[PDB]
Ligand binder design. Structure first.
Ligand SMILES: Nc1ncnc2c1ncn2[C@@H]1O[C@H](COP(=O)(O)OP(=O)(O)O)[C@@H](O)[C@H]1O
Ligand SMILES: Nc1ncnc2c1ncn2[C@@H]1O[C@H](COP(=O)(O)OP(=O)(O)O)[C@@H](O)[C@H]1O
Ligand SMILES: Nc1ncnc2c1ncn2[C@@H]1O[C@H](COP(=O)(O)OP(=O)(O)O)[C@@H](O)[C@H]1O
Ligand SMILES: [Ca+2]
Lengths: 131, 374, 374, 374
């Protein structure tokens, strides 16, 4: 139908879906795949600033995001495997065992364990209009 | 001029409906509550109506208080009730009660004492030329127009199933349910509140009510529906609160109405509708049963859920012997069906003797309306 | 000659305003302080009045001291207060109080004790026929003729937001802000000092008061305004001191008024007017809210600054649901609003019964005014 | 060394109570706020902790800002909570999380989602071997050890009546009440500000709260005492404020607590506690009800005021039928009894399987705690 199938929010070119439920990162990816959506990846601050619009979604929830970490290198990429700019990348802890692809907790990107459950957000291109 | 109509007023638990006979549907329908400022306090001037409620309360919402003088569909009080009747006549109908006959309608177990009082008001204060006392269950049936079948009537306060064979309702078959939309909304509130919303208030009451009526639906399979819910994108539907919050409502929509099917949600021991239907059937003769099964009729506000009909056929068919044919029917605007039947009976030229008259009030007293008449 | 006028004395913190009910605006208006030569010094001759204050004090500036019995609206001491009243009646009004029923205004959490005291003075010393006492905000609200809305009142001493539904100030929602008015001027003296000016004195405070009212404005954006300031050819405006000094002003301009929006300038913990409206908004029912958002009015002298309405609208939407409509209404001569409210209510012949009589005063004591009336 | 404690931590709205199971009382208690200099203003050198709160802020009172992640019991924000827990174990408990299994308690209607979140934090950040999260109400009831009865449980944020029959709490029966100690504290400042005083600020809330406990008593007869008020010398009892000031109190003393009986004071429509209990009792079977009447247990916090029991007995006697036995029981120091329940529950060896484990977390995710257990 319209630029976004229902229950999706549009921001410019993109369409976003905030999942009702918790899924694992990989799992949500498969789920996202079903739609033909992807996980959301944040190319710009502008897009990141839009996240706040999640804020109305009740409370902040952690939301799985595109960025993934290699493990040996620990380099952060998105599913497409581009490089996030500095702004996107994660924050530090003293140390421990474990770490995986980022989520979004409200304002800022974060990292966690995949095995854990988190809400994921998917992104698709809106049917951009041409005349 | 000459000729007379019958005023058809059904004194609903929540919403009373009244009109003229011959009308297809009630001219008036308004809240049946009483309400004031809880806070009050005070002002320069007034111009307020202390406890109209009515339309104005509903618009009123935040300010006012609600009593229902007939919550359990039973005139719990005469003082307020007169007010409803007064409002109905003068305000909404803008008829003079002097001119026309009225049919009041009554809830099913209405103790023969109140009936006399119902009558005495109409004669005494109202001074109607004549009035009839009706049983709303009946009037609903009258509207339907079918002799045999087993109809499920779920309204606001109460749910019944009644087998009907030629036209006579077999008393014994019937069984009562406490549950109806009345409970449903409360429940809706309660589930809503878990998530974090708090819908404690009366204003909030009405908000909850709105949410269920548009929003809520009945599941094909209760179990499947939960399971789906997890994946379910769809269920997520938004509702905008009057303030401007937007609150999201997935699962509750199906869970709420489910209660009718499974009363234990609400903590009713009582069996769900389907068990009800089966039971009422059993109670009757083996021979008759087929007739009911073919003709099941739905009725009342609570029956309006889309999906009910298919669930019912699904449910019943499992229960019933594979031979027996099962049909389900649901007339389109059933909620009104009570008023409708009332309307019809009232109008009846032929039946007119049935109406209760001023003299009869005098000689026999109001009790006449109860005895060897309605 | 007959009939009577209501003497609507509004005892203001800084300014007494009083006149006759029915009048469009306050007749006579003057600063409430008490002052006498601090220095004194003697002379040959006399012909100075010890502590009139009033107008004569203002031009008086260097010579006099000040004293506000009415400090925070609340009448702290009766003796001076009576002096004000005597002056008001006799000097400005030139009218003898025995003749006219009078309504007095009083501040928000004014204790019962003082209210009674107010009555004693009005009856005993003045011997007016009857009095009424009023609560200033309601008089303001009365003046408006707004049944519903959420209003910002900002005057001299205190700033409130009260939502109203049906002419009812819902007590709970209301909140107070310490600051107004005063806090602006003092901040104004202080921020001014830093530049190198000293405005410590009383005369100087008067000077300082002068500047803010003409000089100051509020910004579209604090952050943006601050950035701009460096360029700002504009802000630089000059103010000539009564001695004849000139000063440059203008980063000051926006900043002082800034206080209301972010009290931390003052060091005030409390939240901004904007957030204060929001807090109040939530306090009310969700249902009521659209009404409030739609009807927002600001009241009081502090509300007069140009630009506020546009700012407030902007501030509030940012708060608000997005869907919801926004309106900011500001009536033109609002400062006088309280007095006007004084005049209308006072002037109500219909209402006249409210007027408190010496008979009640003697029998009931002054208390009758407080209890069951105003 | 072998065998293990259960770390029983009680995340209260205002206060956390914590310590080892089997412990007669919680060892450590401290406020739940977050607090860093509002003013700040730098200096030379630091040494301060940005927002420890707990004990130290309380001593800090003038300086600091207060926040409750735990506002209405429910944890709104994880970080501060992470902080709160960090303090709990390390600073106050001086225990290490890895060593001991921990219980955690929860507000009544807690969203599942946060349950997994709570569950998440302790394992991940704390790296506790195993955890249990229990419902505070349930622990309290555990503490009583009363299989049956009806207990009135009034703490800080909320008030409940929970009928209990045979170790089961019947969910339909139990109603809520927003009003609770927090409202009382706010309430009391307001009426005190009424006469003289102004207790706007955070410190002042603490001051009033101090007044609140020592000062407050319930009145035998609301009406009567007011009559008593004029004559009463006794009421006048005096309090000295943290500066110099010594303030007088006395009518407000009873009046504040009055709210529990009359919620309207605070603007609450809802029925009083006496009201609440009756309704809840009616909710249950007639047969059972005798039980609740015999056993009514007080609980929490707000129930401590002397003389509540008899008034409570009185009100209920009035409500009840004449025959009925009524008995009120209030355990001597109930506030803790929430924590008490935990200590036992945690401490239960037999029960020990009950605890949630790292593996159950690991397989199940966190939700195992929520699902099919606590
Ligand atoms: N379209 C609808 N869908 C679902 N429920 C409805 C609908 N319309 C009304 N209801 C519910 O049914 C009730 C009205 O039905 P009614 O037969 O008038 O009940 P009663 O006769 O017992 O008052 C209302 O309480 C409402 O909650
Ligand atoms: N035109 C104006 N622009 C800005 N501020 C004003 C204006 N007129 C009055 N004020 C300020 O508002 C105050 C008067 O408002 P008012 O409502 O009378 O306060 P209050 O009722 O608390 O005494 C004065 O202290 C003055 O500083
Ligand atoms: N001795 C007492 N007398 C009166 N009130 C008390 C007393 N002790 C505590 N309180 C009040 O009860 C509250 C603590 O009770 P609690 O059951 O812990 O509440 P919650 O569990 O909701 O936090 C405090 O807010 C306090 O104001
Ligand atoms: Ca993108």
């Amino acid at each position: 139908c319209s630029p976004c199938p229902h229950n999706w929010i549009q921001n410019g070119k993109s369409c976003y879906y905030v999942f009702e439920r918790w899924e694992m990162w990989n799992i949500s990816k498969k789920s996202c795949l079903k739609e033909g959506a992807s996980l959301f990846q944040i190319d710009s601050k502008e897009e990141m600033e839009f996240i706040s619009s999640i804020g109305k979604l009740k409370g902040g929830n952690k939301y799985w995001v595109g960025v993934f970490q290699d493990g040996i290198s620990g380099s952060w990429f998105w599913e497409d495997g581009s490089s996030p700019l500095s702004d996107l990348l994660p924050a530090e802890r003293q140390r421990s065992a474990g770490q995986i692809c980022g989520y979004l907790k409200d304002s800022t990107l974060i990292s966690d364990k995949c095995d854990s459950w988190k809400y994921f957000i998917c992104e698709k291109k809106a049917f951009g209009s041409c005349i | 001029d000459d000729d007379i109509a019958a005023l058809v007023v059904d004194n609903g638990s929540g919403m009373c409906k009244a009109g003229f006979a011959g009308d297809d549907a009630p001219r008036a329908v308004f809240p049946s509550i009483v309400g004031r400022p809880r806070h009050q306090g005070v002002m320069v001037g007034m111009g307020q109506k202390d406890s109209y409620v009515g339309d104005e309360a509903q618009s009123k919402r935040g300010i006012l208080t609600l009593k229902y003088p007939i919550e359990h569909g039973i005139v719990t009080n005469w003082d307020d009730m007169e007010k409803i009747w007064h409002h109905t006549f003068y305000n909404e109908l803008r008829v003079a009660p002097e001119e026309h006959p009225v049919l009041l309608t009554e809830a099913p177990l209405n103790p023969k004492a109140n009936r006399e009082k119902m009558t005495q008001i109409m004669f005494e204060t109202f001074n109607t030329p004549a009035m009839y006392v009706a049983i709303q269950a009946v009037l609903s049936l009258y509207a339907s127009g079918r002799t045999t079948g087993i109809v499920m009537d779920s309204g606001d306060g109460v749910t019944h199933t009644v087998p009907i064979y030629e036209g006579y309702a077999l008393p014994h078959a019937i069984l009562r349910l406490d549950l109806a939309g009345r409970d449903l909304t409360d429940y809706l509130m309660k589930i809503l509140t878990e998530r974090g919303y708090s819908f404690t208030t009366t204003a909030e009451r009405e908000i909850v009510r709105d949410i269920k009526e548009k929003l809520c639906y009945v599941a094909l399979d209760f179990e499947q529906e939960m399971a789906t819910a997890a994946s379910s994108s769809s269920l997520e539907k938004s509702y905008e609160l009057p303030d401007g919050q937007v609150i999201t409502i997935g699962n509750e929509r199906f869970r709420c109405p489910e209660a009718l099917f499974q009363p234990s949600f609400l903590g009713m021991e009582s069996c769900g509708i389907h068990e009800t239907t089966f039971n009422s059937i059993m109670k009757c003769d083996v021979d008759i049963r087929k007739d009911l099964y073919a003709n099941t009729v739905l009725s009342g506000g609570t029956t309006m859920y889309p999906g009910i009909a298919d669930r019912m056929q699904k449910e019943i068919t499992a229960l019933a012997p594979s031979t027996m044919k099962i049909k389900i029917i649901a007339p389109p605007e059933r909620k009104y069906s009570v008023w409708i039947g009332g309307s019809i009976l009232a109008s009846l030229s032929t039946f007119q003797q049935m109406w209760i008259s001023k003299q009869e009030y005098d000689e026999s007293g109001p009790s006449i309306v109860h005895r060897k008449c309605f």
